[PDB]
Amino acid sequence: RKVIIDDYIGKVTNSYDNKCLLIVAIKSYLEELEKSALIESDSTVEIDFEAQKSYLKSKGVDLSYMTLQEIKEANTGSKVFLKAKIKVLDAMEDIDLSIEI
Amino acid sequence: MLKYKEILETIIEILKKNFTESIFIDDESVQGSEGSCFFVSILSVICTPVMLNTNNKDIVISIKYLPKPQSKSIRMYEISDELNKLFNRNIKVTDRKLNITKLEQSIKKEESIYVLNFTFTLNYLDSVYEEDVVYENMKEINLNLGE
Amino acid sequence: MLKYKEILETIIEILKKNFTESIFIDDESVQGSEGSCFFVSILSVICTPVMLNTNNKDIVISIKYLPKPQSKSIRMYEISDELNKLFNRNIKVTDRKLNITKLEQSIKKEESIYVLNFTFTLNYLDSVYEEDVVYENMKEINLNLGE
Amino acid sequence: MLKYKEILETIIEILKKNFTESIFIDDESVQGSEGSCFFVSILSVICTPVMLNTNNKDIVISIKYLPKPQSKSIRMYEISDELNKLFNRNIKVTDRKLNITKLEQSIKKEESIYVLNFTFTLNYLDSVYEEDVVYENMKEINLNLGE
Amino acid sequence: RNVMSGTWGELWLDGNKVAEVKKFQAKMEFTKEDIIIAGQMGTDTKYMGYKGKGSITLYHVSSRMHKLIGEKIKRGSEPRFVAISKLNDPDSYGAERIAVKNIAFDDLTLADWEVGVKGEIEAPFTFTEYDFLDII
Amino acid sequence: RNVMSGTWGELWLDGNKVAEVKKFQAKMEFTKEDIIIAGQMGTDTKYMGYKGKGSITLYHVSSRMHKLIGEKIKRGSEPRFVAISKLNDPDSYGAERIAVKNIAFDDLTLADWEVGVKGEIEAPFTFTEYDFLDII
Amino acid sequence: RNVMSGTWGELWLDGNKVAEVKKFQAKMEFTKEDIIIAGQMGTDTKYMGYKGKGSITLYHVSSRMHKLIGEKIKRGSEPRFVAISKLNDPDSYGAERIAVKNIAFDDLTLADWEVGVKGEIEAPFTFTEYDFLDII
Amino acid sequence: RNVMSGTWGELWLDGNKVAEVKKFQAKMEFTKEDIIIAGQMGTDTKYMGYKGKGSITLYHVSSRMHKLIGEKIKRGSEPRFVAISKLNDPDSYGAERIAVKNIAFDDLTLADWEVGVKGEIEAPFTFTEYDFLDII
Amino acid sequence: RNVMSGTWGELWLDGNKVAEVKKFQAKMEFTKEDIIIAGQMGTDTKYMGYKGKGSITLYHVSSRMHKLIGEKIKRGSEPRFVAISKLNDPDSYGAERIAVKNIAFDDLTLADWEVGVKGEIEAPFTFTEYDFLDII
Amino acid sequence: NMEARNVMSGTWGELWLDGNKVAEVKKFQAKMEFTKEDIIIAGQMGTDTKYMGYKGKGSITLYHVSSRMHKLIGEKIKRGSEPRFVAISKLNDPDSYGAERIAVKNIAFDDLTLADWEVGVKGEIEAPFTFTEYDFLDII
């Protein structure tokens, strides 16, 4: 939130280039968390395609015969949809040990 | 951008101030004149894109002197120096200064009489038109994270 | 592919919308006109094969303005800017956008009068026709192995 | 070798099948025609020896269209595409296929009227004539060896 | 089918859009070692790593590079940046973006000019990792 | 008699047909050692191995090379491919095909563009063994 | 927007204005060392210093360089100078000046002429520190 | 008097006439060592041997080189050949033939083609001894 | 203001005027060593000496160089000469003369000619000390 | 079977020293030098040897990122007490057949480098040692 709400709310125009810049910033933040071994590696940040599709369908947009790139380029007024994928390691809670005589 | 009409008007005004002979733009008037008339025209324009939004322009501007009465060639040689004294480094058109890369002049005979041809080239970078959509500032940012 | 007739029609339509003077394609009509007529033609086309199925095309398109009444050269200089304002980056022909590599313009005298010549080049890749035989999917594959 | 008459005949036959207007080879006939006639000729041939027995040939073939009646330039632009549709990659002359290296087309005015000029070049290797003496097989070989 | 033309190229450096950019280029060069295996005539190779290399070329509109790195270079601390390149030709079907990270510049050009020539600046750089956005 | 023109060239890479290909080239370079034999002025050579080298040049229509090798190069595992080249000029009597196996690419080009220039990509490679199909 | 042309270039050397100057150039080249870190394919670099290089090109109007350095070079003491370069194109918005300090010249040209050719002199130099005046 | 033109050139390789041949070249390069003798300013040389070098250039009409050497190169045995070159210009007075023996080829070209370009193959080689037939 | 043209150039060699001279050139190249001082990023240099180099280019009117140095070179004793260069363009304000002493020539050209080409001779040389007369 | 890709690369190794992973490691090497005595047996020309023991030797080279080596032994050496450490080396190449791990025990270091630097040169520290025992963990 100190990256998102502090600067990118109400101070930056909502254009696809700025969306890409915000995505890059978030990914660069996640790299530091990965390097401290808090989460696992290979964490991806990208545009939430399904939520954006639903919001576009909510208004008067014919989603047919539109390119996926054309869908992503659409300007969703003043709202941004993003989706992240991160992995967290759980503690040991089950053990299955086998012994051969 | 910058309009060619403005450049032609600026050059014509300079010539009007610095010379007493008449200045014409179309061939019919110089044909109908009694003698010692100028002629101003833009010879050619070349546009090349050097960046996404800007072009590079080279404009060649031609000035002609046609003395009709006899024994006025010495007047042409006098006028050459006065023309040289004006277009040395740059000219100012619409609060913008454009460089003059080189000067060229030649004395050749056209039809039955000799004429003086004074040319020079302007080089400057100019921007093409574009239409930009306006977006409102970011207000709400949704970030959902999962596996 | 893409037809030259469509490109010419698109340019003629643009000129019709943006200018009030008449547009002609043939010499006799511009000769018979009373004055201030346009002329549009495709100067040259060069085709070069860059891949097995595609060619590379460079098309040079010429626009001419011939003002018949006297003292209309200033109108020509005005019209040059309006022509420049339209053909900056690309044009759309049959849901396809073709780049404009460079612009060229020159003012020269033809026959007894001066004319304006506005040209530009389009560059795009296009595919040649071919006939492909249809085969049915593989159903039986025989493989016999020996010494 | 391969004869130029055969190439010209093949091109003339293709044009006859694909177009309804008449095709002529000599200037007198196209002058005497009432309108909308073709003209086919071989522009130039360049021969260069690349090997002992073979030459390299570059043949430029010219096709002309001269519409006499008024308001047939749009027909010229229509015919350009149909001509383009035929000569894409290669042509077959006497069970041999010759490549088409590049295409060129230009619209210029000749005498008082505008004409369309469609050209392309063929490239192929060809063999010169030679006379070879016939020898009989070896029957007796004498080899005497000494100091 | 059309091939993307480089006229439609945009570059973001350190979060700021670079208005003047003539060309951009970034490449990854691999490191290989020759290995000869007994009984085989052909020689095989083993891959050991890679290096990132590239350069920019931009007109001398302003003094960007100095304001970027000049004082920090003297002080003894070397800064690292991130650059984004976008290529979107309208004729082509889709666009392409790349994020290049951990950039370090090879040199700095204080001044360079000649009579009758517009100024140009080219600055090579080396990078370590890249990330891909809007794949075609 | 006619010599085959390179316009009629097709390339298959990793089982997929490469629609855009400007040129293809593959060569085998031998390794020789100088040996001097007593009593002979002329110097002889002994053949001790060979190396396979080549390159491709294709227009920048899509991001093929990245989807091929980008993530695996970072991970630390190098992939190998098989490429097939076919040259069939209709004027010539027959066709020719070659299978090149165990291909490894020398570098990767993330992005390269310039104003007014269509993009081109060339990627050298090294191979070990080849197989021949439809020999003329 | 316009890019500055080098026609509007002036140079001050040792406190004296150089009337004839065809071009001026000064650059800072960095020194880097390759460092390989265990567990990473990409190779990183460490910045260890920099070098200053440049040159001048001026017409052979007078014997300036000799009067500057000739006798001191023979004697055994090498002088150091300060040079100022100014670039102010009227079309562009602002001007730019740089002070280059601790200059040492690489060579001295006694005489050089050819039939039908106007004389030109170019003298490379190396510098250590720079200062910036009137940044853009 | 006339100088022979290379148009009238024929080549026999391994007992088979090579129909397509653009040029042929064979040279003998000597090995010399510098020797300095006391009391003499001029430096003399001693001849210690020679090397044979040359190349061929021929159009890509057929797959000759592969059928010649391909399988044997992989197997591990290098073949040697004999080539005969004849130059007989009708304008000149006589003809010239040379037999080149113990030929070994430097490399093998599997495939090489480009759009709009007829294929050409050039193969360098090294030889040891030569014999002369029909000297002029 | 005018820049001196090289058409007005005269050369005196060994006290004799050289009538035919196409160009003359003499330069002093300094020797520097890199020195790194603790606590400073910029690298400094120390001047440790210099070398004098130059060359002449003159038409092959006569056999001057042989009569100068030929027999003495064979005998084993190398001669040294003094050359004077004068550059006096009437348009320019003043003249310039330089005396170059302790000249030694690098090579000797016995003969060199080709069909349809006028002969030219160029002889590089190395010098130690110079003296200046009529400084502008 | 045998292929070029199977050869292990040194970039993929890592080293644990006293239970703490060392990230700034350049190379690691361990070896065991056997002791053999020549014995001449009557009636046979070829000499034969008898094995009596082994000696362990090795070294570690690492970038001079931090003063790690001082904190381990600097104060203890002056007082007269010698510490013993345990090192674990793991070599995990994705292309090769898995990974091999070895534990080297009873390590005693040969020298301590207080300071070593030169103008214009990056810093490196190499420390040789001797050991006595070893274990095999996940050998290929």
Provide the CB-side half-sphere exposure for E134 (13 A, CA): 26
Sign of CA dihedral F70, F72, F77, F81: negative
User: Which one-letter amino acid corresponds to residue H30?
Assistant: F
What is the distance between the alpha carbons of residues D29 and D39, in angstroms, rounded to a whole number? 10
DSSP A68: H
Report the largest interatomic distance among the alpha carbons of chain C, rounded to a whole angstrom: 96
- CB of J97 within 8 Å of a chain F CB? The answer is no
Q: Of H113, H106, B90, give the one whose Cα is nearest residue G88.
A: B90
Cβ partners under 8 Å of residue F111, min gap 6: E24, E25, E26, E85, E87, E96, E98
- CB of E74 within 8 Å of a chain C CB? The answer is no
DSSP I103: E
On whether the CB atoms of residues F54 and F125 are closer than 8 A, the answer is yes
Percentage helix, strand, coil, to 5, in chain G? Answer: 10, 55, 35
Of E1, E47, E136, the CB nearest to F78: E47
Backbone angles phi, psi at B10, to 5 degrees: -65, -45
Local structure of B122: helix, strand or coil: strand
Phi-psi domain of J106 (left: phi exceeds 0; alpha: psi -120 through 50; beta: other): left
* Helix (H) or strand (E) run with residue F26 in it: strand F23-35
Chain F residues with beta carbon closer than 8 angstroms to that of D96:
91
What is the distance between the alpha carbons of residues E22 and F117, in angstroms, rounded to a whole number? 11
- Give the neighbours of chain C: at least 3 Cβ pairs within 8 Å: B, D, E, F, H
Q: Of J124, J87, J88, give the one whose Cα is nearest residue J109.
A: J87
Going through E36-126 in order, the beta strands assigned E by DSSP cover 44-59, 81-87, 96-105, 107-114, 120-126
Resolution (Å units): 3.6
Q: End-to-end distance of chain E based on CA atoms, in angstroms?
A: 14
What is the distance between the alpha carbons of residues E97 and E132, in angstroms, rounded to a whole number? 6
- Give the neighbours of chain F: at least 3 Cβ pairs within 8 Å: B, C, D, E, G, H, J
Cβ partners under 8 Å of residue G77, min gap 6: none
What the block records as the tokens of C101 is 């590599």
User: Which one-letter amino acid corresponds to residue D25?
Assistant: I
Report the largest interatomic distance among the alpha carbons of chain B, rounded to a whole angstrom: 96
What is the distance between the alpha carbons of residues I121 and I109, in angstroms, rounded to a whole number? 7
What is the distance between the alpha carbons of residues A22 and A33, in angstroms, rounded to a whole number? 17
What the block records as the tokens of D2 is 């391969």
Nearest CA in chain H to E42: H74
Of E1, E3, E90, the CB nearest to C90: E90
Nearest CA in chain G to E62: G136
Sign of CA dihedral I113, I117, I119, I121: negative
Per the listing, tokens 């619209």 go with: D107
For residue E73, the distance in angstroms to the closest alpha carbon of chain G comes to 9
Chains E+B touching (3+ CB pairs under 8 Å)? yes
**Using alpha carbons only, what angle is made at residue B107 by residues B105 and B110, rounded to the nearest 5 degrees?**
125
What is the distance between the alpha carbons of residues D57 and D45, in angstroms, rounded to a whole number? 7
Local structure of H48: helix, strand or coil: strand
Backbone angles phi, psi at D77, to 5 degrees: -65, -35
On whether the CB atoms of residues I125 and I54 are closer than 8 A, the answer is yes
- CB of J29 within 8 Å of a chain E CB? The answer is no
Chain B residues with beta carbon closer than 8 angstroms to that of F115:
49-52
How far from I85 is each of F28, I89, I131, CA to CA, in Å? 59, 13, 11
How far from D19 is each of D15, D16, D83, D107, J17, CA to CA, in Å? 6, 6, 9, 20, 89
What is the distance between the alpha carbons of residues G51 and I56, in angstroms, rounded to a whole number? 35
What is the distance between the alpha carbons of residues D92 and D97, in angstroms, rounded to a whole number? 4
Backbone angles phi, psi at E59, to 5 degrees: -70, 155
Mutation choice for C interface testing from F4, F5, F7, F24 by most C CBs within 10 A: F7
Nearest CA in chain A to B141: A80
Beta bridge partners of E31: E49
Give the pairing of strands E81-87 and E129-133. Answer: unpaired
- CB of I41 within 8 Å of a chain E CB? The answer is yes
What is the distance between the alpha carbons of residues G21 and I111, in angstroms, rounded to a whole number? 42
Phi-psi domain of I121 (left: phi exceeds 0; alpha: psi -120 through 50; beta: other): beta
DSSP J40: -
DSSP D38: E
On whether the CB atoms of residues E51 and F82 are closer than 8 A, the answer is no
Backbone angles phi, psi at B137, to 5 degrees: -65, 155
What is the distance between the alpha carbons of residues E78 and E82, in angstroms, rounded to a whole number? 14
On whether the CB atoms of residues F45 and F33 are closer than 8 A, the answer is yes
Beta bridge partners of A88: none
What is the distance between the alpha carbons of residues E11 and E64, in angstroms, rounded to a whole number? 14
- Are the Cβ atoms of G41 and E50 closer than 8 angstroms? yes
Task: Give start and end residues of each alpha helix (H) in chain F.
Answer: 64-75
On whether the CB atoms of residues B24 and B30 are closer than 8 A, the answer is yes
Chain C residues with beta carbon closer than 8 angstroms to that of D121:
none
What is the distance between the alpha carbons of residues D1 and D126, in angstroms, rounded to a whole number? 7
On whether the CB atoms of residues F66 and F110 are closer than 8 A, the answer is yes
Axis crossing angle, helix C4-18 with helix D73-84, rounded to the nearest 10: 140
Q: Of C72, C61, C70, C77, give the one whose Cα is nearest residue C15.
A: C61
Mutation choice for F interface testing from D124, D126, D128 by most F CBs within 10 A: D124
On whether the CB atoms of residues G135 and E67 are closer than 8 A, the answer is yes
User: Which one-letter amino acid corresponds to residue H32?
Assistant: K
**CB neighbours (10 Å) of residue J115?**
7
Cβ partners under 8 Å of residue G129, min gap 6: E74, G52, G101, G102, I42
Provide the CB-side half-sphere exposure for I102 (13 A, CA): 8
Q: Of E100, E121, E109, give the one whose Cα is nearest residue E22.
A: E121
How far from D93 is each of D9, E113, I90, J61, CA to CA, in Å? 9, 61, 75, 77
Q: What is the 3-state secondary structure (H, E, C) of I9-42?
A: EEEEECCEEECCCCEEEEEEEEEEEEECCCCCCE
On whether the CB atoms of residues F9 and F24 are closer than 8 A, the answer is yes
* Helix (H) or strand (E) run with residue G52 in it: strand G44-59
- CB of C43 within 8 Å of a chain F CB? The answer is no
What is the distance between the alpha carbons of residues F95 and F134, in angstroms, rounded to a whole number? 7
Axis crossing angle, helix B4-18 with helix C73-84, rounded to the nearest 10: 140
How far from D116 is each of C59, D7, D73, D119, CA to CA, in Å? 15, 21, 9, 10
Phi-psi domain of B6 (left: phi exceeds 0; alpha: psi -120 through 50; beta: other): alpha
- Are the Cβ atoms of E46 and J11 closer than 8 angstroms? no
